[PDB]
């Protein structure tokens, strides 16, 4: 009929009365809150005009409705163009809905079905969705009255195409007429004829592209096509609009203003592609993209994490920035990953009234600021009441340029006038500013703008100890020195606490009064960041701020590596042991190799002679201003006493150097032998022996099969006094060592008896000797046990033992 957009329905059905006049819906359809509704609002209501819906269908809380076979008879296409948590069909909390009733459903190409909490719902098990959907594996159909099976889903075919193999029916008066024949996913008509290959489901005339019920892929000018020809673009993967309708959607959203890529009129370009206004095209950026974002009325006042995270992705901004964040949890890494993407600001930047920030180095790559939108008084950088900000940027790295406007620095008390002059020299704002734009006494009144650089005199190293010394530094009234602070942190790169006792001056002809500190508990092979600052008293005249040292990068030494972690071992083969480990916690430089030593172990000598024919036969299974004030109190006592006293008138194991592997197969071993294993690591082997101390494990291979299986003959003896002596061939290689022998023996008609033969019973009787036998035809069978287990039987050896009667 005619094209409507998507709409959302609440309360009433006057929205259903302007859903009467529509046929084609370009959007999504939601049903929520039909609290008022009756059966007599829904037995006089029918919409057969509707055929197509793009995005999704949502249902919530309908009273009084029973079915949709007399409400929605002709709905086929569920496209799923906007995929919505991969669920294109959601239905939640239907009371009184006994059936689904969408008997002309042939199409879900893209999307899945969520059914939940509809307590009156039968007619689900006679719907084959595999003819409809391309994949039914993601469909979430749960919590119905069909799921607790009492539902009388009766068919017309009790006629219906049966696809369990049950007869398939949507309603009681219509069948599952989705065509499984040679007409295929395009579908057949009611006469059984095939439709066109750009038709979908049904066709109003058979094999017609002009007269499909539903198009398969695309739609242009009363006909179903497979792709758009030029100048028409692929509009939302269902129809063909062109430059005029895509440009009227562009100037209607002048809203995701509609762009051209891959002959499609898509809403926004993807991440390799950028907007250029001259051609209206997704130009191929594929990397460092000029992302230009237009603001809402020239400003965005930003004050939290969630208000900060709107601009994550935007680089160039068309407007001004107002920043007012005063607190948070563990800042500037996520604020650096946010606000280090900014290149150019067209408006001003106003840092007003912030507290908790300590640097502006979360702003990473800011090079050019326009400042076209200004503050009244022509200000582009407005710093106001910003408390704890110690640095602006690092000026070995950063360059910044202000195009237009002036500066404003009022009440920013922890930042220096050399950084204000570095802003006025680097930023191009030397002659722009008027009188008292910079409030001079409010900024840098309480800081450390120290006017001297310390020099590191003497430096030593160890693996865990750095012996630092530097110069003697004093203030010129040197009772104000409290000593030094030095901060340490771990330094993996160059990408940037001990209180120190003061030294003793007295006098100096040549006096070594170099102070310093030995730091004791260091991690080996670790580059560190050490700098030394001074702690003076804020005096009553023009201030000596003190001095600070250079940051240095001093690395600790290696010496011995540590124990490499966790020796564990699983036996793969009988000659192969994989040894696996982890690297140590102190690697101590670039490690050359891992050094392993393996020793074959001899057996236990107690267990040659343990008779386990005796019972007990078990085998093992094998804050600062207090003490700033308090030291100036002893200065001013001493000034008072001076102003009233003084007045004018080898075991070589087999071993291997494991180069660039964290595992080693240990080959060349015997079957089922205990082993002794030394594991070490070594970062320096050829210029002398800096290998580590040993890691200790023991291991054992998996056993063989036929090492425990008995090879050799079964040979009896017949003596004079009815005594049977049996010898055999022992396996000379068992799995590890042999322990015990067992004889199962049974006469011709009798039962099987047992006998325990030990190794001392073998070695005393050269085999085994049997006495006291009933006369008959015995058969003897011998199993044997080792340290591993029970290797299997011998043959039945038939022998007639003597009777001495006949």
């Amino acid at each position: 009929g005619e094209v409507c957009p998507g709409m959302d329905i609440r309360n009433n059905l006057t929205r259903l009365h302007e859903l009467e006049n529509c046929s084609v819906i370009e959007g999504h359809l939601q049903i929520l809150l039909m609290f008022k509704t009756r059966p007599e609002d829904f037995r006089d209501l029918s919409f057969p005009k509707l055929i197509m819906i793009t995005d999704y269908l949502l249902l919530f809380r309908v009273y009084g409705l029973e079915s949709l076979k007399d409400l929605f008879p002709n709905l086929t296409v569920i496209r799923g163009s906007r995929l919505f948590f991969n669920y294109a069909l959601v239905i939640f909390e239907m009371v009184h809905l006994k059936e689904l009733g969408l008997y002309n459903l042939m199409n879900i190409t893209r999307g899945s079905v969520r059914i939940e909490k509809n307590n009156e719902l039968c007619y689900l098990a006679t719907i084959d969705w595999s003819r409809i959907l391309d994949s039914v594996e993601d469909n979430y159909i749960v919590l119905n009255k069909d799921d607790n099976e009492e539902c009388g889903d009766i068919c017309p075919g009790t006629n219906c195409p049966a696809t369990q193999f049950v007869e398939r029916c949507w309603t009681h008066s219509h069948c599952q007429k989705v065509c499984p024949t040679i007409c295929k996913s395009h579908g057949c008509t009611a006469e059984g004829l095939c439709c066109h290959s750009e038709c979908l489901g049904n066709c109003s005339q058979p094999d017609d592209p002009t007269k499909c019920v539903a198009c398969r892929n695309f739609y242009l000018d009363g006909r179903c096509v497979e792709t758009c020809p030029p100048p028409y673009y692929h509009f939302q993967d269902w129809r063909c609009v062109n430059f005029s309708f895509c440009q009227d959607l562009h100037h209607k959203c002048k809203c995701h203003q509609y762009v051209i890529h891959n002959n499609k009129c898509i809403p926004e370009c993807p991440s390799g592609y950028t907007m250029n206004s001259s051609n209206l095209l997704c130009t191929p950026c594929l990397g460092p993209c000029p992302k230009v974002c237009h603001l809402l009325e020239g400003e965005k006042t930003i004050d939290s994490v969630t208000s900060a995270q709107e601009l994550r992705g935007c680089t160039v901004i068309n407007g001004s920035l107002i920043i007012n964040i005063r607190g948070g949890n563990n800042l500037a890494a996520e604020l650096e990953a946010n606000l280090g993407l900014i290149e150019e600001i067209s408006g001003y930047l106003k840092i007003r009234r912030s507290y908790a920030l300590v640097s502006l180095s979360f702003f990473r790559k800011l090079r050019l600021i326009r400042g076209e939108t200004l503050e009244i008084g022509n200000y582009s950088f407005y710093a106001l009441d910003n408390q704890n900000l110690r640095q602006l940027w690092d000026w070995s790295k950063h360059n910044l340029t202000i195009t237009q406007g002036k500066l404003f620095f009022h009440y920013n008390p922890k930042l220096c006038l050399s950084e204000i002059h570095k802003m006025e020299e680097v930023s191009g704002t030397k002659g722009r500013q008027e009188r008292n734009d910079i409030a001079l006494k409010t900024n840098g009144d309480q800081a450390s703008c120290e006017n001297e650089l310390l020099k590191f005199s003497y430096i030593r190293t160890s693996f865990d100890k750095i012996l630092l010394r530097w110069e003697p530094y004093w203030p010129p009234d040197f009772r104000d020195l409290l000593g030094f602070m030095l901060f340490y942190k771990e330094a993996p790169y160059q990408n940037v606490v001990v209180d120190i006792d003061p030294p003793l001056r007295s006098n100096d002809p040549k006096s070594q009064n170099h102070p310093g500190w030995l730091m004791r508990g260091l991690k080996p092979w670790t580059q560190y960041a050490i700098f030394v600052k001074t702690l003076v008293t804020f005096s009553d005249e023009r201030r000596t701020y003190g001095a600070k040292s250079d940051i240095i990068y001093v690395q600790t030494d290696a010496t011995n590596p540590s124990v490499p972690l966790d020796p564990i071992s699983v036996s793969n083969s009988s000659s192969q042991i994989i040894l696996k480990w982890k690297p140590p916690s102190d690697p101590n430089g670039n490690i050359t190799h891992y050094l392993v030593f393996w020793e074959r172990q001899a057996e236990d000598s107690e267990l040659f002679e343990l008779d386990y024919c005796l019972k007990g036969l078990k085998l093992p299974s094998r804050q600062i201003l207090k003490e700033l004030e308090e030291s100036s109190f002893r200065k001013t006592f001493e000034d008072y006493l001076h102003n009233v006293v003084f007045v004018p008138r080898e075991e070589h194991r087999p071993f291997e150097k494991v180069v660039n592997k964290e595992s080693l197969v240990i080959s060349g071993l015997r079957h089922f032998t205990g082993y002794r294993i030394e594991l070490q690591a070594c970062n320096q082997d050829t210029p002398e022996e800096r290998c580590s101390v040993a890691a200790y494990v023991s291991a054992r291979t998996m056993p063989e099969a036929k090492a425990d299986d008995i090879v050799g003959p079964v040979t009896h003896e017949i003596f004079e006094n009815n005594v049977v002596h049996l010898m055999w061939q022992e396996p000379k290689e068992p799995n590890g060592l042999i322990v015990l022998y067992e004889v199962s023996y049974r006469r011709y008609g009798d039962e099987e008896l047992h006998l325990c033969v030990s190794r001392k019973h073998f070695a005393l009787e050269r085999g085994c000797r049997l006495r006291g036998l009933s006369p008959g035809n015995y058969s003897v069978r011998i199993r044997a046990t080792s340290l591993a287990g029970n290797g299997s039987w011998t043959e039945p050896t038939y022998f007639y033992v003597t009777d001495y009667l006949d």
Partner: peptide, 24 residues
């Protein structure tokens, strides 16, 4: 008074520097 001094506390450079004249 070094082992009972400075592993309940922290000892500095000057007392070990003057205490290695007992080593010397």
């Amino acid at each position: 008074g070094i082992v009972e001094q400075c592993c309940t506390s922290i000892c500095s450079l000057y007392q070990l520097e003057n205490y290695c004249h007992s080593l010397q």
